[PDB]
Structures are given as C-alpha cells and as structure tokens.
Design a protein around this ligand. Structure first.
Ligand SMILES: Cc1ccc(Sc2ncccc2C(=O)O)cc1
Ligand SMILES: Cc1ccc(Sc2ncccc2C(=O)O)cc1
Length: 299
C-alpha cells in the first residue's frame, strides 16, 4: 500500500502495536559473540543491546578492538551510517578513535546528557573553548571551536587532533536538544528541519566517512533518524515514489543492528516524518522554510 493512506488505515483501526510486533517477529537474528565476551562488559551500556559480529565497527588496535557500534550500509540509497550507544566514562576515548579512523565529518546526538534524572551518556565533548580535552588512552585532543545554540538544536564546530601524527580535522556536532523525556514529538517539523541541517553540512555525503549517530542505546531515536533519511532519499531516486515501503526499509536496516525503532509510537512518528517530509521536498522547496518557521528554532 501507499504510505499516507496505510497510515490513516492503521490510525482508524488502532493497530500500531500489532504492526510493530510483526516487525519484531520478522527481524534478523545474527550472532554478537564479541560483544558478550567478559572483557567487554564495561564497554556496553545495556546488556540487551549489542552489535552483530558481521557489521560491528572495529577499532584499529591489537589489544581490544571492540566498541558498541554498527555499520548500516544502504545499497540502493547509497548512504551509510554508523549507529552507536552514548559513550560511557570508559569509552569516550574509543568513541573519538572511531570517528578518526572511519573519516567521519559529523556526529549526530539525539539525547541530553541527563534525562529523567539519570545520566544517559558521558560529557564527551568540551563546553568551553579554553578547556580542551585530552584522551590519553587513544592519544587524541579535542577542542571546542564555536557553538551555535538554536531553539531546537545546537551545532558545534570541533577540532580533533591525532597527537601521534599532529594531523587535525574539523568535526561538526549536531545536537538535537528537544526530544521529550517520554514519548515522541507531537509534530515532526523540528526533527525534519534538523535532518535537513545535517544534510546541508556535507556530513551525510559520499566524500566523507559515515556519519556517527547516537542516542542512549543507539537504536530508538537513532533508528528514527536514519530510517527517515533513507526513505526520503529513495522517494527522490525512484520513478515511482509511492513504491517506497517503510516497513521493508526498516527490516533491511535491522539486518545491520538489532532493535531499531523501540516502540510503536516511534514507528508511527517515523511514518509521520516521511509523509510530511515528502511534501516539503517538492518539488515543494518552500516547505523547508515552513518547517524552519514551525520549529521556532530562534532563541
Ligand atoms: C581541522 C579544522 C580546521 C579548521 C576548523 S574551523 C576554524 N578554526 C579556527 C578558527 C576559525 C575557524 C572557522 O571555521 O571560523 C576546524 C577544524
Ligand atoms: C535495554 C534498552 C534500553 C534502552 C533502549 S532505547 C529505548 N528503550 C525503550 C524505549 C524507547 C527507547 C528509545 O529508543 O528511545 C533500548 C533497550
């Protein structure tokens, strides 16, 4: 079926939980043996969220090459993403090692450091220009260059230096700051405006390594971001945009990391985002300005 009318048909029939459970039943199951080795227990935030062996990102280190991160490679859309958990106190150095080794330009963060009164990830970037961070275990230095705070998100320019070779690179940090502690946003307008800002930066483009995207576990909000981006790109590439099947795309992405999209509410929100985003793309270029306005990002 098409998307927008399949959407109204699930709303009127109130069957989002059943649709989502079907996806869970059909999703791939691949081994994650490296994640479960005892030496890696303090490298995993959640015991039930692990990268598959076949798609996990390897650190270029001979002692322990493990990080909780997966390469999602979308062949028809010609986009790749790295999805990872929020860094832990003992993995912030591994996190920036991965960014360096994979030649990423951008990092997309979809959570706040504290949510629901508990820590959801480490403070892994510097908050003041004059107070840089040094990661001694991986020999990297990280400096805040500039920060632009908007109403729904913040963009930061960061400098990452490999202290071994004295090479430097500019990394862009895209921080969506307004996802609610419970549930999903009422309108997808600010999330879509954010996605378009990441796109406009070059961070998703083939001349760079894959974008690194995370939330707390790296499967829920993170899955919503890459699912919406890939579906919109396929609608632009194909002769028949109504042939894009969001459930089939999600199952393809779940071949590369378990658990993407964590609730039926996140599934419904992903449909909403793709539906509204397809109107702004067209050919309606003006819709982009509309999203920006409706997002009230200023202040
Ligand atoms: C490796 C790297 C190089 C350059 C930059 S940007 C910059 N650096 C210093 C002053 C100003 C800027 C600016 O972009 O205005 C970031 C990272
Ligand atoms: C064990 C575990 C912990 C956390 C997560 S993320 C999550 N969990 C439950 C609902 C929603 C989300 C979300 O994606 O926001 C997944 C698994």
């Amino acid at each position: 079926m098409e998307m927008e009318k399949e959407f109204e048909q699930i709303d009127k029939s109130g069957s989002w939980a059943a649709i989502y459970q079907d996806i869970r039943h059909e999703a791939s199951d691949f081994p994650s043996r490296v994640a479960k080795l005892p030496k890696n227990k303090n490298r995993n935030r959640y015991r039930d969220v692990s990268p598959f062996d076949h798609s996990r990102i390897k650190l270029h280190q001979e002692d322990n090459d493990y990080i909780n991160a997966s390469l999602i490679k979308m062949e028809e859309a010609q986009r790749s993403y790295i999805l990872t958990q929020g860094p832990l106190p003992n993995t912030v150095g591994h996190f920036w090692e991965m960014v360096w080794e994979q030649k990423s330009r951008g990092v997309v963060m979809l959570n706040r450091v504290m949510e629901k009164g508990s820590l959801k990830c480490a403070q892994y970037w510097p908050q003041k220009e004059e107070k840089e961070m040094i990661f001694e275990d991986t020999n990297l230095k990280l400096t805040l260059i500039s920060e632009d705070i908007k109403s729904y998100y913040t963009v930061r320019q960061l400098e990452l230096e490999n202290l071994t070779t004295q090479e430097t690179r500019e990394i862009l940090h895209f921080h969506y700051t307004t996802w609610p502690d419970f549930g999903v946003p009422e309108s997808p307008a600010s999330f879509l405006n954010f996605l378009f800002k990441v796109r406009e930066s070059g961070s998703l483009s083939p001349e760079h390594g894959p974008v690194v995207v995370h939330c707390s576990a790296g499967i829920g909000r993170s899955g919503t971001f890459c699912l919406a981006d890939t579906c919109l790109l396929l609608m632009d590439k194909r002769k028949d945009p109504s042939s894009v099947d969001i459930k089939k795309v999600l199952l393809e992405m779940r071949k590369f990391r378990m658990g993407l999209i964590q609730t039926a509410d996140q599934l419904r929100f992903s449909y909403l985002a793709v539906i509204e985003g397809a109107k702004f793309i067209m050919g309606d270029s003006s819709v982009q300005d509309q999203w920006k306005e409706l997002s009230h990002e200023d202040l």
